[PDB]
Design a protein around this ligand. Structure first.
Ligand SMILES: Nc1ncnc2c1ncn2[C@@H]1O[C@H](COP(=O)(O)OP(=O)(O)O)[C@@H](O)[C@H]1O
Ligand SMILES: Nc1ncnc2c1ncn2[C@@H]1O[C@H](COP(=O)(O)OP(=O)(O)O)[C@@H](O)[C@H]1O
Ligand SMILES: Nc1ncnc2c1ncn2[C@@H]1O[C@H](COP(=O)(O)OP(=O)(O)O)[C@@H](O)[C@H]1O
Ligand SMILES: Nc1ncnc2c1ncn2[C@@H]1O[C@H](COP(=O)(O)OP(=O)(O)O)[C@@H](O)[C@H]1O
Ligand code: BEF
Ligand code: BEF
Ligand code: BEF
Ligand code: BEF
Ligand SMILES: [Mg+2]
Ligand SMILES: [Mg+2]
Ligand SMILES: [Mg+2]
Ligand SMILES: [Mg+2]
Lengths: 741, 70, 209, 144, 69, 18
């Protein structure tokens, strides 16, 4: 660690042009009390200040007032490189201008009042772009150094000529200067960032390595991936920090109605990029000027493709210029354009990780006055399938929710907003929680599940099934470290089979409400179409969207509908159900990465299911959800009657013991008949009391008259078939015992 | 019902979305002998289409919807 | 001229659109104190006949910002390189004058999702829209508003943050919404004195817009 | 070099199984007691294991099992070990405990483990193999 | 890929023979074998053998699903 | 062997028909 880089600390010396170093820092780097030092911080900005021995400073970080700190675009707790410059010398002239909102109200001689005593005998070391502050006349004015004669930076000796002018401005320019996007805003794709920045920066800083190794560096970038990942932000940062010439080309921007004008526009753009300097060309959205030369039917597109292929690599092709392209799909590009020399190194800026989302959260929440109690680690851990561009939407929704909360209680004051509430706004944690609960990833906006409202405590009984489903769902989500320490892949599939009216769809809804993963739900024949292969395309697209924004859980409802075994029809319907079964078997376990794809299947007919899809790796857990016993019947009777008023003398034990063959749907029918009878009694009593709350709860008489027409759902033959299938599944566990070692 | 592959289930999904969209509606499902047929197994395309339309009715009547008023 | 008080019955979506239209344009002091740029995209979907064009006319007639109207297929042409030029001319005319509001009506006719169609002109129009809505120096004090009957036939790169981030759901109203629509549409007709609107709103169930 | 991997050789066209297009019809059978031990050794290659734990009893107990079933057994044992580790972590935080997979985890994972293929499909595959061997009729030591 | 020793050795040599020694194949004057088909019970190691061929054998690998094209 | 027995029966039936 070279001791020439230091962190920003609070300021003791309240002077503008000054920084404080400690004496043990002075012997570690020779400097003095009068020495004028150049501070170069982030965003490629600089400033000049006077170093002064400070005992409290402690050598490791430096004290600088908020004015210096601002000009460098840094904060308290940011690193800066310090280095001395005596090459700078006394100014010839200076060009400062007051910022409009800091002088609204007064007028007259700003020089005699503010500037004259501020610069006098101090010979301040200023810089172009600096914004300093002068306190006097019961206010503080801000000027910006617009120009100096002696290069970028100079000193203000008594002989130096200070020129101020009075046409002040609104700070639109100041906001633009602060914004310049810097290399430290694309945090989350380190390997792709390094792979771009290497061929961007290394043949421009020092080409001696390439002159010694003899070979020429690659001059082509193709940034492909999902939309909303940071390719345009990377191109903007390359355009903003790299001092070479830049030229941005949009996709359908060169196209003109004249015959032979788009190729002339491309030639003029390339000759303009080659004429000035070694430059960088960013051609964005190359899927509109490269339709693969075979699937297209026009002539202008083929001639544009030939113009690009000739002008990018041919005779006297490219004299020290590099082309960067950005696309949403890499497959609809010409393979001659995907060649070496034109577009050779294809970086893959893809879906980030937990630390990448934490870096994006720390980048996007560094300019707002957020809180003193909001943590970003849980926000980055509970966010699962966001593409990296929805994090800014999350923070914008949280800020808008906080603003909408502050706008309704206190009056808006539509003429002018009172500035007392602006100093204390903040962003709380429940705003971020509401913004997380009221958003979705941008890739899963088309298969959004409707907002059902159930609870794990609303599904009575089945405690072993519930804890096994919770284990299977939340072990690879919450603890990936144990799974990567043991070096094994987690189990993902689970199938629910049993009698209808039991709680399989209710268990799927209870999963869809409050698991720590995204939910994608389908019906049985919902993904089938009338064309040839469109059902296969729908299956492949929904599985790519499930495995892209991982972790998700897929609820394949009616596996009897979506999957037959094979070839069961004597006369085929075109041979499509077997292809759907084959595509399901390939997508659930094939030549993929298998990041996180949980498959939940709920059927009521396990005889017509493929044994190739009943096999481990796709659906290993064959969970049988049986009919409830007495205790499970009591718990579902207490859970279906969770939010209702009841009589205190009501005993559900006789209802749980008298039925002894019922199910959850039949008990819900009993509860609904009792509620309908109570509603009829309330309507009759209200009509009687209005002709000449009558009942505040449901009585035992309503249940006694509702249990007169109660009937079972399943018969004694379907239960025989289900128990025979369960006994066959238990007979598949033959040649086994307690297995004591 | 229809000739093509999945058009009957698309019509079922369309009429059930029209039912649950402008809720409350009431649907008169006539001839459940013709629609349901109590699937079992028949080893044919008619049996496959019957299984598909029955499972579509099962996922549309009580499935993962809002079940406002049908 | 229609105002904000003619879309009674969809007050939640009215507030959700009126916030991002009025608050960044009336006084930006809260957004400058919090240091967060506001969202700049509206996508009003739902059933046909709910009031999205009426909301667009209300935010056109109410606010003092410039309003440039762009229809669905009116930007198309037969020459190669003309529809993208019309879209670029519309965007520069909306960006050059003032902080303005753009209303692209029927966006499902110029967004065929770039995968199910074989025409290069539609892909070029979608690429021009994706470049003009999110690129280098993309939007300066302007905001786009969409209105479509089907929300699934739009490119996911167009259904993203920065282009169309706030997808409001102007859906069917409840009985109070029918009461507000019946009270708004019957304010210019002297109908009777012994007539009620509560039973008229409570009788119908499937009447939307 | 085309490679086909189909779990039902009945629906294949008989002109593709002709030599010159797909001549090597390799039947991949179920593993025996000497192959299930090697499968369990290959699946447990990158995990810490008990030095006293043997896989011979697991290879000898399962006779109609498959590699997917052995992977399911290994995954259930790992899930039980992860559950015991997080239970010990919660008890330690209330008031590395599990360094490897013990024998009780395998004994609890081998209780809910079943075979993938049934007896009728195995009979169908042996019938297809015997039909292919009956297509290899009139073959012997073949003296010249 | 545990087990399947003879199948693994036969598949590996059938792939690696004409791409490393073509001189013996043109000395004998015959074209090498091309195709190989695996069939059996599901979940046995066919796709695992294909992945083992894809990951380390010097020939270029083009993977394609069934109804994908 | 390459061809099965039923394909030879189908080809013999087609040769007897034509
Ligand atoms: N990895 C990332 N790091 C930081 N900001 C990101 C990242 N990905 C997306 N964003 C933000 O998303 C917004 C839109 O991203 P942008 O670059 O314009 O789109 P795209 O990735 O489609 O080219 C910007 O505000 C940008 O800063
Ligand atoms: N085990 C159960 N516990 C609690 N409620 C149940 C149970 N089974 C059924 N119900 C009630 O009856 C309804 C029908 O159950 P559901 O999951 O929709 O059907 P199915 O069992 O056919 O998948 C549930 O939504 C719930 O209201
Ligand atoms: N929610 C609504 N509230 C009030 N008027 C409505 C509403 N929806 C529709 N209307 C009326 O219906 C007519 C057509 O509605 P409009 O906004 O053009 O819908 P769209 O463009 O979706 O077809 C207009 O006269 C409008 O005033
Ligand atoms: N012989 C084996 N050795 C090791 N693991 C195996 C073996 N057979 C199966 N597996 C495991 O089970 C999975 C299923 O095998 P796979 O080749 O995908 O099945 P299939 O033959 O149906 O295509 C493999 O991916 C692997 O994890
Ligand atoms: F430009 Be982004 F990838 F939508
Ligand atoms: F979904 Be249930 F089993 F009818
Ligand atoms: F008919 Be509207 F555009 F909803
Ligand atoms: F590919 Be295997 F037969 F599941
Ligand atoms: Mg872009
Ligand atoms: Mg169900
Ligand atoms: Mg309209
Ligand atoms: Mg396979």
């Amino acid at each position: 660690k070279k001791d020439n880089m230091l962190l920003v600390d609070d300021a003791i010396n309240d002077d503008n042009s000054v920084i404080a170093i400690n004496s043990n820092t002075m012997d570690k780097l020779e400097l003095f009390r009068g020495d004028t030092v150049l501070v170069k911080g982030k965003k490629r900005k600089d400033t000049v200040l006077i170093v002064l021995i400070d005992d409290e400073l402690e050598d490791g970080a430096c004290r600088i007032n908020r004015v210096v700190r601002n000009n460098l675009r840094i904060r308290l707790g940011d690193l800066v490189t310090i280095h001395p410059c005596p090459d700078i010398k006394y100014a010839t002239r200076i060009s400062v201008l007051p910022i409009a909102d800091t002088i609204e109200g007064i007028t007259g001689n700003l020089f005699d009042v503010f500037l004259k005593p501020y610069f006098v005998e101090a010979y301040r070391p200023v810089r172009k772009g600096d914004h300093f502050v002068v306190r006097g006349g019961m206010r503080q004015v801000e000027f910006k150094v617009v120009d100096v004669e002696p290069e970028e930076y100079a000193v203000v000796a008594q002989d130096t000529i200070i020129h101020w002018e009075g046409e002040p401005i609104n700070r639109e320019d100041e906001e633009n200067n602060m914004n310049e996007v810097g290399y430290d805003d694309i945090g989350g794709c380190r390997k792709q960032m390094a792979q771009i920045r290497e061929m961007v920066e290394l043949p421009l800083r020092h080409p001696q390595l390439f002159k010694a190794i003899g070979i020429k560096p690659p001059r082509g970038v193709l940034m492909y991936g999902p939309p909303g990942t940071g390719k345009t932000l990377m191109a903007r940062a390359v355009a903003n920090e790299t001092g070479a010439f830049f030229f941005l080309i949009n996709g359908p921007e060169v196209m003109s109605k004249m015959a032979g004008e788009s190729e002339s526009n491309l030639r003029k753009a390339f000759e303009e990029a080659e004429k000035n300097a070694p430059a960088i060309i960013f051609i964005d959205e190359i899927d509109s000027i490269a339709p693969k030369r075979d699937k297209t039917n026009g002539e202008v597109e083929r001639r544009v493709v030939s113009q690009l292929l000739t002008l990018m690599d041919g005779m006297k092709a490219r004299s020290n210029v590099v082309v960067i392209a950005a696309t949403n799909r890499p497959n609809s590009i010409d393979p001659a354009l995907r060649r070496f020399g034109r577009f050779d190194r294809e970086v893959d800026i893809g879906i980030p990780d937990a630390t990448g989302r934490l870096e994006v959260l720390r980048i996007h929440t560094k300019n707002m006055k957020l809180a003193d109690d909001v943590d970003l680690e849980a926000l980055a851990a509970e966010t699962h399938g966001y593409v990296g561009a929805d994090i800014a939407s999350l923070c914008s929704e949280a800020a808008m929710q906080q603003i909408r909360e502050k706008m309704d209680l206190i009056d808006l004051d539509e003429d002018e907003i009172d500035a007392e509430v602006l100093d204390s706004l903040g962003v709380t944690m429940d705003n971020f929680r509401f913004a997380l609960g009221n958003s979705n990833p941008s890739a899963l906006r088309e298969t959004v599940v409707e907002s059902v409202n159930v609870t794990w405590d609303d599904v009575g009984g089945l405690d072993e099934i519930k804890e096994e489903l919770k284990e299977t769902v939340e072990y690879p989500v919450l603890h990936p470290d144990q799974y990567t320490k043991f070096g094994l892949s987690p189990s993902k599939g689970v199938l629910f089979y049993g009698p209808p009216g039991t709680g399989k769809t209710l268990l799927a809804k209870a999963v869809a409400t409050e698991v720590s993963a995204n939910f994608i739900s389908v019906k049985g024949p919902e993904l089938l179409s009338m064309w040839y292969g469109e059902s296969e395309s729908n299956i492949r697209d929904i599985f790519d969207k499930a495995r892209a924004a991982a972790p998700t859980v897929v609820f394949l409802d009616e596996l009897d509908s979506i999957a037959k075994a094979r070839g069961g029809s004597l006369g085929d319907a075109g041979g499509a159900s077997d292809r759907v079964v084959n595509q399901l078997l390939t997508e659930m376990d094939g030549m993929n990465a298998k990041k996180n794809v949980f498959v939940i299947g709920a059927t009521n007919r396990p005889d017509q299911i493929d044994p190739a899809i009943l096999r481990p790796g796709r659906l290993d857990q064959l969970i049988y959800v049986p009919l409830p016993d007495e205790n499970a019947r009591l718990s579902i009777l207490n859970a279906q009657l969770r939010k209702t008023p009841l009589e205190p003398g009501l005993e559900l034990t006789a209802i749980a013991k008298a039925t002894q063959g019922f199910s959850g749907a039949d008990l819900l029918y009993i509860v609904q008949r009792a509620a309908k009878y109570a509603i009829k009694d309330s309507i009759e009593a209200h009509r009687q009391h209005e002709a000449e709350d009558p009942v505040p709860y449901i009585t035992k008489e309503h249940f006694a008259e509702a249990m007169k027409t109660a009937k079972r759902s399943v018969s004694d033959a379907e239960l025989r078939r289900y128990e025979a299938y369960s006994q066959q599944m238990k007979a598949s566990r033959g040649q086994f015992s307690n297995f004591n070692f």
